[PDB]
Design goal:
The complex is a heterotetramer, with 2 copies of chain A and 2 copies of chain B.
Chain A (H helix, E strand, L loop, with lengths): L1 E3 H19 L11 H12 L9 E2 H11 L5 H11 L10 E4 L17 E4 L1 H7 L9 E3 L6 E3 L8 H5 L1 E4 L4 E4 L4 H12 L6 H4 L13 E3 L2 H9 L1 E7 L1 E8 L2 E8 L6 H13 L6 E6 L9 E5 L5 H11 L3 E7 L1 E4 L2 E4 L2 H42 L1 H10 L3 H12 L3 H9 L7 H26 L1 H19 L6 E3 L1
Parallel strand pairs in A: 9-18
Antiparallel strand pairs in A: 2-4, 3-4, 5-6, 7-8, 9-10, 10-15, 11-12, 12-14, 13-14, 16-17
Helix pairs in contact in A: 2-3, 7-12, 7-17, 12-15, 12-16, 12-17, 13-14, 14-15, 16-17
Chain B lengths: L15 E5 L2 H10 L5 E5 L12 H6 L1 H10 L16 E4 L5 H17 L1 H5 L3 E3 L14 H9 L7 E4 L3 H12 L3 H11 L4
Parallel strand pairs in B: 1-2, 1-3, 3-4
Antiparallel strand pairs in B: 4-5
Helix pairs in contact in B: 1-6
The chains are: A alpha+beta (481), B alpha/beta (192).
The structure holds the ligand O=c1ccc2ccc(F)c3c2n1C[C@H]3CN1CCC(NCc2cc3c(nn2)OCCO3)CC1, chloride ion (CL) and manganese (II) ion (3 copies).
The structure holds 3 DNA strands.
EC number (chain A): 5.6.2.2
Keywords (chain A): Antibiotic resistance, ATP-binding, Cytoplasm, DNA-binding, Isomerase, Nucleotide-binding, Topoisomerase
Subunit structure (chain A): Heterotetramer, composed of two GyrA and two GyrB chains. In the heterotetramer, GyrA contains the active site tyrosine that forms a transient covalent intermediate with DNA, while GyrB binds cofactors and catalyzes ATP hydrolysis.
DNA sequence: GTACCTACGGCT
DNA sequence: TGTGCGGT
DNA sequence: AGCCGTAGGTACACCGCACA
């Protein structure tokens, strides 16, 4: 009962550091998620909060996640869910929110007692096949529930939505990307394991921010994709236009990713006020729901508007850099990874998911066909089946007699005893036969997939292609030069 | 005011200030409004009942002070209509019984400290749709379309038609004598 | 429209708020003793199956479920209401069984809802008992997506047992808690004599009984409160004078008045000493512990008269506090000042209705089941023909029609037959069905006997109340001293 | 914020430093108030290894601990003025409780080192099954963690002042890389 | 992670 | 030095 | 006075890392 201070510091600090690293601040390379986000989405899945259903109150979603999966504060959970519903934060939003979910001015969401949420349609693709033994479940924090170690993630979410996180001894900053480009990149990789980063860059041009804007040049992108680290220069979308009486204005319609618009405006106001920038006569945020983002900087008559714009870029967040630092959990450990690595781990995850799903579907189809073979024997000899049951004093005796007389398994005998008399009508008998015939065909299709690795790989391609066609959208961020 | 999200125009004749219950409603209102002519002032919950409070308490209350500063008219004897920063002061409480209560508290304050603002027809009551626990439950476009868009909104202009009757109504409903308020409830309550 | 008269706006908006606070927030229903938030909390616990035999469930989750389904208000109002129902210093018969930090007599609040866990107490099962036997009317919830109870069956007199306090609009309420044994004995005496007087009822119900024990001074305040619904009741702490060594003494307080914050009472005594408004006190300590119970010690100066000091403490601090009884509850959905008898009468009438409605529900249910059994007896006695009828039929609609006409069966009987699983054809099932049928006919007769005789129904209410009294009734804690 | 004990004899008095008011309430009810004081601390405490002295002395939680201990700090540290002979760190049993423990030890080691040398600093061992002390009932907290008859307190011992100095600098200091290297060298994934 | 206002009646 | 975001 | 208990609101700290 004596503790050396040095040993205590080392073990307690390591305990904390390791936990923040593998179970808090860093995303998994396979699904792009940290624990709180995974638990929020799993919670939505388990409470049936699909896009075709009505919005559910946020307080309730949060209460459920806290109880069953996430032993931490309600505010960490709610704020994480809120960001997933912000179209200025997530390139492909994962939560469909109803109500005040915050704004680009740093206004927070309304209290969870007011807002409502459900899954977006793309989130269905993160969860698809989760109940087909595609991913390993683990015990939750108190051993009363089960939770997914990782989501099937049928689209490359790490790269699609990006991630940022501050851990201990390290951090991560992965920018979002265009979904059509990423899937084309995965498809190219799938046809050539030895593809180079430069080759992958014919599909994946660079980041694609939800807030659009511009990226200056490709050297920082290239460095980031090659090594996991690189500086990417982002600029607002700004133009110079006339405003009457020989005067001009600078009009900003897109801002850099993660830049608070109100803050950026106050920074300009502060520079004007302190006379650290010349030529500006007015500053207005004309953003509206109907006009979109619109920040106007009026320029003094005869002043060079282009000079003023270059000055705003040097002195304000109108120009901002994104420091790429691609750290993710790979096999449960933090790893700095390049673009190809990120895609390789994602692709392997997809192959495993689709293989496991195919194996699961085969087991369940064989089980069900076995049951239907039992029901078909019962229909073929219904008079005898009835006599056998009627002569039997108990269920146990009837079970044994059915197994003995009709060479049935215990599962088949129990299915026959469970069959309702309505199943004996013409339509119901035909349904039993039709389901069986369809099932034999389905079993044949599954066996083909499992017998040939190229057929499986091709199925992965086809499913990715379908997702690309349904959810892929245009590039927003312009890469200049 | 720190909480005031003012409009661009400085021409009072065309500007409107919307009074909402807090930041939950303020965020939706801020995003949906027309920032050129519509200012928003989120207010911190149940408003001080000025009919029950003495002057020192009233003048030191943060929400009261915000409203006075934002309207720019001064108060009581020093009220100057000509200095009104908005020609429409719009009460936009949440669509619940508590929002109705907040509305009575706000009207009490305007009636006792800014009566000419009411007499001039500058005080309005917004009509957000029912079925929402608060404006923070509404999307910004729904709030704009149903409640703030002048092309579709239905604002109620508050009218003072008999001052003696209004004085008695404010004293009875909002004053310190419980018995008269109990009597009013008993005489008017329809439990159906 | 376009215009709105200020006077009309004020009258209508204020009345809207006042009525809502009165009938759906701050005042308890006379029948179950509950306000909407508490009723929704208990119904929530029942619907999520959070009974005393199941593990504790996270408070945050309970509150989230209540918030979404039944109570469209702040999470803090819900959690704090739940917390109070779990405090043994607040509720004479706690309705919630809490795990974790649920606050103290010193005004410490509960731990954040993220940390605590809760479930129903055993006595709460009595509030909810028979709720699914059409004993009480259900209503639509706030958004039309759920159903909630307008009132609970409340198989014990909860209004009076746990009491209530509420600040509404135009009025308030203050009902003290009572001893459950005494209350049930009072309801029983009343059930045998509609003309019983308040004085006779007081032979059963001696006065309030606080979860915090203590003393009540005299019966005058109690008597008027029971006769009129209003009266002042003087509560006094339990205090004794004892030696502490070397010829010195101390006052030791082991019980304090209901709703008095212990730490604040101690600060008030300390304030009086510091400002020299009381003479003779040399030390003040809170020696309260989980092992020893409440123990507040006030050291007295050698040779000072400890009883004079104690009397001064009663006059100058909350060591003595009054409970202003003001018994307002919702009666037929309207607030009413009620006396002790009127409270018991409405409670007893609620019990008669609950038991009557339950009996009627059980009767409809038993007859429905007897009807089904009749159809199954026919099916089993003619099974070969039943099966061939079904096999020859292309759809179950055709099967249903043939079964009904051929065997003189209702639609419900024919459906039950089509739903019957093959395992129901075993040899001993036909007798098992016959046994249930015979028992059911007897049961129907027993239920019909109850509904045909008001005295038999009334006796069933007495027996059920008596069983609750024997299982949950406990000793009086508050001593009433005369006086 | 301090809920002191009755006794004013430091030799027999103990102060428990707990995580949040949530834990404070259970602790205050379950303790022996004659000899046990409770100081509830608000969240993660300041990392004194990274902070400027002016910020350290101005921090509310740091001030409350100095006032409670009564010994003063640094060069003015007077071990004889200690108001308790047992300063017990009782954080919730998990990774953030572990983190708060390292932060507290950092403060004690850099500002009240003799307190550790004198053997006045202890670590409580609340049961592992509760991710917060506010989840436990007062009696269970008393029995398992605060009752001298059954509790298992760890006495903090300083064995090598040079190795300790390097450890606090490495783990708690501003140089990220040494912390990243320590993690890489010692992590058992 | 917590502390505080308000309505309401009664006594790079 | 302020800010991105999961934690107390 | 300020306390009781359901209601309407919401504001400020701490850790950890890496950018400009
Ligand atoms: O605005 C302010 C301003 C200042 C301030 C100061 C101190 C202070 F403590 C607080 C302050 N506040 C707010 C307040 C802090 N809040 C955090 C969130 C907390 N919510 C609990 C909760 C609800 C749930 C749930 N789980 N947990 O699960 C599902 C149902 O709803 C309630 C207290
Ligand atoms: Cl004496
Ligand atoms: Mn055959
Ligand atoms: Mn509101
Ligand atoms: Mn913890």
């Amino acid at each position: 009962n004596e503790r050396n201070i040095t040993s205590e510091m080392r073990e307690s600090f390591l305990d904390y550091a390791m936990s923040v690293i593998v179970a808090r601040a860093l995303p998994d390379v396979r699904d792009g998620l940290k624990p709180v986000h995974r638990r929020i989405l799993y919670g939505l899945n388990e409470q049936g909060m699909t896009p075709d259903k009505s919005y559910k109150k946020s307080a309730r979603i949060v209460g459920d996640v806290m109880g069953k999966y996430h032993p931490h504060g309600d505010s960490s959970i709610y704020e994480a869910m809120v960001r997933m519903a912000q179209d200025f934060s997530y390139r492909y939003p994962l939560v469909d929110g109803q109500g005040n979910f915050g704004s680009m001015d740093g206004d927070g969401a309304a209290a969870m007692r007011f807002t409502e949420a459900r899954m977006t349609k793309i989130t269905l693709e993160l969860l698809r096949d989760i109940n087909k033994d595609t991913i390993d479940f683990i015990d939750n924090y108190d051993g009363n529930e089960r939770e997914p170690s990782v989501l099937p993630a049928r689209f490359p979410n790490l790269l699609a939505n990006g991630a940022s996180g501050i851990a201990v001894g390290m951090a991560t900053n992965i920018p979002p990307h265009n979904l059509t480009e990423l899937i084309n990149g995965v498809l190219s990789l799938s046809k050539n394991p030895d593809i180079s980063i430069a080759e992958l860059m014919e599909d994946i041009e660079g980041p694609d921010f939800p807030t659009a804007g511009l990226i200056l040049g490709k050297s920082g992108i290239r460095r980031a994709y090659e090594t996991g680290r690189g500086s990417i220069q982002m600029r607002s979308r700004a133009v110079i236009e006339e405003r009457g009486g020989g005067r001009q204005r600078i009009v900003v319609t897109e801002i850099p990713f993660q830049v608070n618009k109100a803050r950026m405006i106050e920074k300009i106001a502060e520079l004007v006020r302190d006379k650290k920038i010349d030529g500006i006569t007015d500053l207005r945020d004309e953003t509206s729901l109907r006009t979109g983002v619109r920040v106007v900087i009026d320029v003094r008559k005869d002043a060079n508007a282009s000079v003023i714009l270059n000055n705003l870029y040097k002195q304000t967040p109108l120009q901002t850099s994104f420091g790429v630092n691609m750290i993710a959990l790979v096999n449960g450990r933090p790893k700095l990874i390049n673009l190809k690595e990120a895609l390789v781990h994602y692709l392997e995850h997809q192959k495993t998911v689709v293989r496991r799903r195919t194996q699961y579907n085969l087991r369940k189809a064989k089980d069900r066909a076995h049951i239907l073979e039992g029901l078909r024997i019962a229909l073929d000899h219904i008079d005898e089946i009835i006599s056998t049951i009627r002569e039997s004093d108990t269920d146990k005796v009837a079970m044994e007699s059915l197994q003995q007389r009709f060479k049935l398994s215990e599962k088949q005998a129990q299915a026959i005893l469970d069959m309702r008399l309505r199943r004996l009508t013409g339509l119901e008998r035909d349904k039993i036969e039709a389901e069986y015939n369809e099932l034999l065909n389905y079993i044949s299709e599954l066996e083909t997939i499992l017998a040939d690795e190229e057929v499986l790989l091709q199925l992965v391609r086809d499913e990715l292609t379908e997702i690309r066609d349904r959810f892929g959208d245009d590039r927003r961020t312009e890469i200049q030069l | 005011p720190g909480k005031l999200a003012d409009c661009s125009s400085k021409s009072p004749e065309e500007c409107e200030i919307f009074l909402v219950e807090g930041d939950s409603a303020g965020g939706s209102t801020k995003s949906g409004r027309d920032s050129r002519t519509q200012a928003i002032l989120p207010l911190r919950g149940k408003i001080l009942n000025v009919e029950k409070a003495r002057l020192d308490r009233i003048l030191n209350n943060n929400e009261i002070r915000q409203m006075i500063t934002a309207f720019g008219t001064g108060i009581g004897g020093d009220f100057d209509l000509a200095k009104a920063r908005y020609h429409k002061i719009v009460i936009m409480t949440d669509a619940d019984v508590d929002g109705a209560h907040i509305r009575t508290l706000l009207l009490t304050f305007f009636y006792r400290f800014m009566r000419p603002l009411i007499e001039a027809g500058y005080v309005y009551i917004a009509q957000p749709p029912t079925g929402y626990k608060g404006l923070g439950e509404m999307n910004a476009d729904q709030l704009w379309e149903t409640t703030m868009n002048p092309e579709h909104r239905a604002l109620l202009q508050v009218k003072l038609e008999d001052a003696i009757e209004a004085d008695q109504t404010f004293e009875m409903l909002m004053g310190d004598v419980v018995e008269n308020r109990r009597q009013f409830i008993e005489d008017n309550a329809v439990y159906a």
